[PDB]
Amino acid sequence: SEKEFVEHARKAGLVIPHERLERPIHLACTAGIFDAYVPPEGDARISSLSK
Amino acid sequence: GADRMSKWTSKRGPRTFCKGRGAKGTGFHGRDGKFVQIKEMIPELVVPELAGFKLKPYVNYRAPEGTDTPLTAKQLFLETAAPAIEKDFKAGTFDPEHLEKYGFEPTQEGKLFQLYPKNFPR
Amino acid sequence: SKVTLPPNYRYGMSRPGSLSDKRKNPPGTRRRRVPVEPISDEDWHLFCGDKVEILEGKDAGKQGKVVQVIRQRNWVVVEGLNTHYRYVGKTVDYRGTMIPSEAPLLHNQVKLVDPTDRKPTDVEWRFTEAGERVRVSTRSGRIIPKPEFPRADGIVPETWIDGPKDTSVEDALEKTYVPRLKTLEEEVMEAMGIQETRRHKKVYWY
Amino acid sequence: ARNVLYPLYQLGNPQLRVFRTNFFIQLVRPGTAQPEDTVQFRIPMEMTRVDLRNYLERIYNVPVAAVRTRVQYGSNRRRDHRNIRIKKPDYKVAYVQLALGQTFTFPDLFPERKGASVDVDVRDQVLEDQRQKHSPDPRRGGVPGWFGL
Amino acid sequence: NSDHDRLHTLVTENCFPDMVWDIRYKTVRWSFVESLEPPQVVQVRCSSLMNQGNIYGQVTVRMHTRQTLAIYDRFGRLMYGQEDVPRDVLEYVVFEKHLVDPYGSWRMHGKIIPPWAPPKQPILKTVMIPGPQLKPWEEFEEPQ
Amino acid sequence: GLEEFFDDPKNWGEEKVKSGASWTCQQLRNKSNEDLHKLWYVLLKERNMLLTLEQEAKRQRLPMPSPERLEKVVDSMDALDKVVQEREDALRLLQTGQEKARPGAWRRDIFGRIIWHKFKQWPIPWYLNKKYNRKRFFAMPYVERFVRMRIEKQARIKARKRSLERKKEKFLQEKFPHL
Amino acid sequence: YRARPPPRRSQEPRWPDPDDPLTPRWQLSPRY
Amino acid sequence: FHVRVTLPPRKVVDRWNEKRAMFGVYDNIGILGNFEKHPKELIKGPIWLRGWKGNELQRCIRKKRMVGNRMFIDDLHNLNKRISYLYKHFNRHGKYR
RNA sequence: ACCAAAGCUAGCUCAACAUACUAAACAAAUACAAAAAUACACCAAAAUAAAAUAAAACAUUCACCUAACAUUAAAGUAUAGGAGAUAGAAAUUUUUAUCCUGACGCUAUAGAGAUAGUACCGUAAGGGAAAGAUGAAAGAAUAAAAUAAAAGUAAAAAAAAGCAAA
Ligand SMILES: [Mg+2]
Ligand SMILES: [Mg+2]
Ligand SMILES: [Mg+2]
Ligand SMILES: [Mg+2]
Ligand SMILES: [Mg+2]
Ligand SMILES: [Mg+2]
Ligand SMILES: [Mg+2]
Ligand SMILES: [Mg+2]
Ligand SMILES: [Mg+2]
Ligand SMILES: [Mg+2]
Ligand SMILES: [Mg+2]
Ligand SMILES: [Mg+2]
Ligand SMILES: [Mg+2]
Ligand SMILES: [Mg+2]
Ligand SMILES: [Mg+2]
């Protein structure tokens, strides 16, 4: 007479489980392009001639 | 009906059921019905002087530990009585009958802190 | 303190008392038991921090450093070799930080490699004449040094600074014990000069 | 001390002395508005008023004046997944009124840091900017923006 | 071709999501036809982090080249553009390599587009951009 | 000195507070009884402070800064208590030869079990004790049947545990034919 | 494989331990 | 009547293991061995069933007579009740009489 | 298309051997109203088994029925029995040491009641359950594949007439 439902999908991560990982994350890349290239304003009229 | 798994504490009975929670008694009942507290029954905390104490609750992390060698009766005897016995036997004055001069207590009923009856809490 | 676990417990590379493990397996679950090959502590030759090679998988023949070992499921994991990609930053309307996590591997799939020729070998335990038990390779016939690995605390003894509540090494290692036949109580009473003349009466025990 | 066998007292017996006490107390912030001279402790259930008075006067050298104790009962209503009641342990609460006119106010043991607040605000702003720049362009209508042309 | 394993081998973890997330439920027909200007290396940058003792080197390559892109819908209808149009595109592909790693494959990391680049080809369908949804206690403000 | 229940005011808001390693049995044994007695209260003050900090963290719904300090202090106090108990046990073995510090006897209660009845401290002998005299240390003839049931139940439990372990070993050998 | 050694009836005399309480009485009677 | 949707793991049973190869190898130990041992002695099992066969009542009677002094309390009670029930059923119930 | 369906494990059962048999915990408190440190006592007790049943009734009788002598025979014999139902020996004979022990036993309505003597039901003695299923990895839930097969519904209410079918 007192059976209940289960499986309430929730995502709640705290700083303690986010910092209590024994082994660290072994990344294969970086977050972004450090020292991002800034192309010069004039490229459309310089791509016409090769030299 | 009433519960059976729950603990039978002093909160679960009538007024006439006043059960202690485990604290040791500290006196008796006097003449006119009051409670007479005995000073000797109250524990006296023997707290030392920590003003000049050069030790801290934690040890240095680089300090080495040692191999676990729990102290045994054999080691205690070797440390406290074996040199004296050896020296006295070499001198030739050793008396097997009398051992009270070496720390041996034939009867514990004389001293204050007895070992087998355990007259002291801690 | 230690946590208690039901006998029907499955190990998933997560701390048993961790929130992720709790959400994966609630306290009321009991899953099917997986067969685990019994390997004793005296025969477990795969430690943490040593270089190993991969036998089967997508990264066949690749070598990596062991970062964790789980004795309950006979699992050994290497950093960034056998990897599947997962998203860790999940929100209602934003995603990112897709990192490659790595799956565990078995002792039958991971074997130790000696640092001399960097070729796969079979490890057998041997007793040296010096009283030490060091792993000895059989393919080549050389000993493999113990792979010293940093502990999970994160502090190395070489660089440590004492705080206000830490004893100095000399004070901690100073020996002041005089092994006499007096109790701690008697010695403290004598040291502090507490004089007690009267003695206890007769007490019956039964 | 607790969990130890106190020696039986009879007429003329020596004074009972405890050298290494087994009692550990906690100083708690009152949940109700108390007067300035009252300090709230959570003490082991085996401790008495005289024991707490000696504990505070000797170990910490606190001029206490009054001690009043009560036993708080822990709830036994919450049920486990096996329908077995889980009982929170009972605990002893003591109120200590100071003597020499000293007034004790529980300190703020977690003061917020301005630098920490600024760092949190900067992180939140960066996350919001990242979400805004990752949000798809409505004018594109679901066509991916990764491809050049 | 929807080859996720080889795509992971080729591009990096910062490039796979931006190119797969919003394309998994569509059909793409991408082809390479010509390259008028060969790709040219523009700059090389290196970042060393001493916390882990790891050095990452990214090389930026400017590429002006011609493809034929046709992105289809999940129902099989055209969505972005026709298949036979050889449009010219100029981009800056930034590759990243982990030099400390013994293997260290060269993987595409980022795609930089100039701010002055011409706008992409218009989509085939029309788009409605709704105005700010107003509660009864809010009055619309006309921006000028 | 009521502030001793709290840490230094400069460490109140810090997220992580570092501390040294825990005391060990060899280091405790190297020290004299005076230093052990002083270190007991030195650790007692720190344990009280850490308990106060933990309770305040629970009250404020914030994580306690580096909660391993309480575990380290508890371990150090346990090691000190173990060292003192070892010294007392060795001395009492030397002086009296009794292994246990409290008198006791192997008794047989009315339920048929063999128990270790510890002795309590009384002001009157055993034959004059109202409360002690009505206790019963012996088993009536109707208890042998229940004792036999207990023996048989334990035997059944042990036998089925052994059979389970044998079946598990055989299944593992069948599943992993490495021989 | 190789078969186990055949079960053979030993021809030497057999004498049970008289001190064993578990030995049957027919093995201790004089007729035995 | 729902039946499984997956193939069960096909048991790789071999007919040439040790037990199957040496099954009943000394069944003729007497006949080919200048009689000393009956094939009774090769039977491994309960003490009250080595070289003997009977119906349920006879088996229960023999078990009680042979190993009844070492049975547990409930086991002996169950054996006695089974013996009584079998006696009553066999000596008072049936059709052919 | 919902509801749903299928795993193979937890563990059980029956025997052999066996140390020789009330496991581990027992810091303190526990037969004051158990888990309540502490006061001049009293403590202990035995006296046949009965009946349901069979004798087609039921009165004398009614194998086993919580007491050791096991096995092959004598033998279901001598005997005892409202001489009915049934009960039933003995004298006298046979029994060669140890390993070779696992399973033509069950696989979650089965096998122990057991995930447990727990929830729950009774004042108490006492009775007593049901409930598990992905994956090498869920530190792979913008998660991936197999059945979409019971009854009950929806997709899709019905059109004179009748054991509903032929
Ligand atoms: Mg009830
Ligand atoms: Mg009450
Ligand atoms: Mg009331
Ligand atoms: Mg008073
Ligand atoms: Mg009160
Ligand atoms: Mg009748
Ligand atoms: Mg009838
Ligand atoms: Mg009638
Ligand atoms: Mg009748
Ligand atoms: Mg009868
Ligand atoms: Mg007659
Ligand atoms: Mg008649
Ligand atoms: Mg069942
Ligand atoms: Mg249907
Ligand atoms: Mg019709």
Give me the long-range contacts of C194-199 (CB less than 8 A, separation at least 24): C194/B46, C194/D17, C196/B112, C196/D14, C196/D15, C198/D12, C198/D13, C198/D14, C199/B110, C199/B111, C199/B112, C199/D14
Give the closest-approach CA distance of E62 to chain C in angstroms: 26
The CATH architecture to which D1-149 belongs is 2-Layer Sandwich (3.30)
**Strand F104-108 to E107-112 pairing:** unpaired
For chain B, state the CA radius of gyration.
Answer: 26
C101 forms beta bridges with: C84
Determine the 3-state secondary structure of B114 from DSSP.
coil
| Residue numbers preceding breaks in chain H (C to N > 2.5 A) | none
Give the closest-approach CA distance of G5 to chain H in angstroms: 10
Q: Where are the beta strands (DSSP E) in chain H?
A: none
Q: Amino acid letter at C26?
A: P
Q: How many CB atoms lie within 10 A of CB H17?
A: 11
**G6 contacts on H by Cβ (under 8 Å):** 26, 29, 33
Question: Which residues have CB atoms below 5 A from the ion given as ligand 4?
Answer: B 35
**F83 contacts on B by Cβ (under 8 Å):** 71
CA of E129 to C1' of I2 (A): 38
**Way it was determined:** cryo-EM
**Does C190 contact B at CB distance below 8 Å?**
no
Residues of E with CB under 8 A from a CB of A: 12-14, 37, 42-43, 45, 47, 56, 58, 60, 62, 64, 90, 92, 94, 96, 98, 101, 107, 109-110, 112, 114, 116
Backbone angles phi, psi at D53, to 5 degrees: -60, -45
- Of D5, D102, D18, nearest to D58 by C-alpha is D18
- Of B44, F74, D58, D46, nearest to C185 by C-alpha is B44
**Residue carrying structure tokens 């946590």:** C3
DSSP letters spanning F52-92: HHHHHHHHHT---SSTHHHHHHHHHHHHHHHHHHHHHHHHH
Determine the 3-state secondary structure of E43 from DSSP.
strand
Q: Are C179 and B80 in contact (CB under 8 A)?
A: yes
Nearest CA in chain A to E43: A37
Contact flag E79-D143 (C-beta cutoff 8 Å): yes
Contact flag F125-C204 (C-beta cutoff 8 Å): yes
Distance between alpha carbon E60 and the CA centroid of its chain, in Å?
15
Residue D27, burial from CB neighbour count under 10 angstroms (0-12, 13-18, 19+): buried
**Does G31 contact H at CB distance below 8 Å?**
no
Residue C166, burial from CB neighbour count under 10 angstroms (0-12, 13-18, 19+): buried
- Chains linked to D by 3 or more Cβ pairs within 8 Å: B, C, E, F
* Torsion over CA: F120, F122, F124, F130 (sign): negative
Q: How many CB atoms lie within 10 A of CB D85?
A: 13
How many angstroms separate the CA atoms of C55 and C78, rounded? 13
Task: Report helix angle F68-95 to F33-60, nearest 10.
Answer: 150
Nearest CA in chain F to B120: F101
What are the residue ranges of helices labelled H in chain C? 19-24, 169-173, 184-192
Burial pattern H31-68, b for ≥16 Cβ within 10 A else e, equals eeeeeeeeeeebeeeeebeeeeeeeebebbbbbbeeeb
Contact flag H73-F152 (C-beta cutoff 8 Å): yes
Q: Write out which nucleotides of chain I lie closer than 7 A to a protein Cβ.
A: 5-18, 20-23, 26-46, 53-54, 63-66, 68-72, 86-87, 93-103, 105, 108, 115, 118-120, 122-124, 129, 132-142, 146-147, 149
C123 forms beta bridges with: C137
Q: Are C24 and C30 in contact (CB under 8 A)?
A: no
Edge to edge, the sheet with strand E107-112 lists: E27-49, E54-72, E87-98, E107-112
**Residue carrying structure tokens 């591997």:** C105
Give the closest-approach CA distance of C86 to chain A in angstroms: 12
How many angstroms separate the CA atoms of D22 and D91, rounded? 16
Do D and H touch, counting CB pairs below 8 Å (3 needed)?
Answer: no
How many alpha carbons lie under 13 Å from residue C139 in its C-beta half-sphere? 13
Determine the 3-state secondary structure of A18 from DSSP.
helix
How many alpha carbons lie under 13 Å from residue C20 in its C-beta half-sphere? 15
Name the strand (E) or helix (H) holding C76. Answer: strand C75-78
Number of alpha helices (DSSP H) and beta strands (DSSP E) in chain G: 0, 0
Determine whether the annotation assigns residue B17 to a binding site.
yes
Contact flag F37-D27 (C-beta cutoff 8 Å): no
Ligand showing the shortest atom-to-Cα distance for residue B17: 2
**C30 contacts on D by Cβ (under 8 Å):** none
Q: Where are the domains of chain C?
A: 3-148
How many angstroms separate the CA atoms of D37 and D130, rounded? 53
Fill in the DSSP letter of residue B24: P
**Does H18 contact F at CB distance below 8 Å?**
no
How many angstroms separate the CA atoms of C184 and C182, rounded? 7
CA of H50 to C1' of I73 (A): 18
CA of F13 to C1' of I87 (A): 96
**Residue carrying structure tokens 């919003």:** E22
Name the strand (E) or helix (H) holding E17. Answer: helix E16-20
How many angstroms separate the CA atoms of H48 and H59, rounded? 8
Give the closest-approach CA distance of F147 to chain C in angstroms: 26
Nearest CA in chain A to E16: A29
Determine whether the annotation assigns residue B6 to a binding site.
no
Determine the 3-state secondary structure of E111 from DSSP.
strand
CA of A13 to C1' of I132 (A): 28
**Does H69 contact F at CB distance below 8 Å?**
no
Q: What tokens does F75 get?
A: 């371990």
Nearest CA in chain F to B78: F94
How many alpha carbons lie under 13 Å from residue C9 in its C-beta half-sphere? 15
- Of C174, E102, A5, H75, nearest to F28 by C-alpha is C174
What lies within 8 Å, CB to CB, of B25 at 6+ separation is: B41
How many angstroms separate the CA atoms of C100 and C87, rounded? 9
What lies within 8 Å, CB to CB, of C138 at 6+ separation is: C121, C122, C123, C124
For chain H, state the CA radius of gyration.
Answer: 21
Name the strand (E) or helix (H) holding E70. Answer: strand E54-72
Determine the 3-state secondary structure of E19 from DSSP.
helix
Q: Which nucleotide is nearest to F131 (CA to C1')?
A: I32
Determine whether the annotation assigns residue B94 to a binding site.
no
Q: Which nucleotide is nearest to G13 (CA to C1')?
A: I96
Question: Which residue among F73, F86, F98 places its CB closest to the CB of B70?
Answer: F86
- Chains linked to C by 3 or more Cβ pairs within 8 Å: A, B, D, E, F
How many angstroms separate the CA atoms of C107 and C75, rounded? 7
Determine whether the annotation assigns residue B14 to a binding site.
yes
**A47 contacts on E by Cβ (under 8 Å):** 37, 64, 90
Q: Where are the beta strands (DSSP E) in A1-51?
A: none
Q: What tokens does H87 get?
A: 């006696």
**Does C32 contact B at CB distance below 8 Å?**
no
- Of C199, D7, C87, nearest to B110 by C-alpha is C199
Distance between alpha carbon F72 and the CA centroid of its chain, in Å?
17
How many angstroms separate the CA atoms of H53 and H60, rounded? 11
Contact flag E16-C100 (C-beta cutoff 8 Å): no
**Residue carrying structure tokens 């949940």:** D31
Q: Which nucleotide is nearest to H45 (CA to C1')?
A: I15
Q: How many CB atoms lie within 10 A of CB D137?
A: 10
Give the closest-approach CA distance of A9 to chain C in angstroms: 9
Q: What tokens does B62 get?
A: 């680089």
To one decimal place, what's the resolution in Å?
A: 3.2
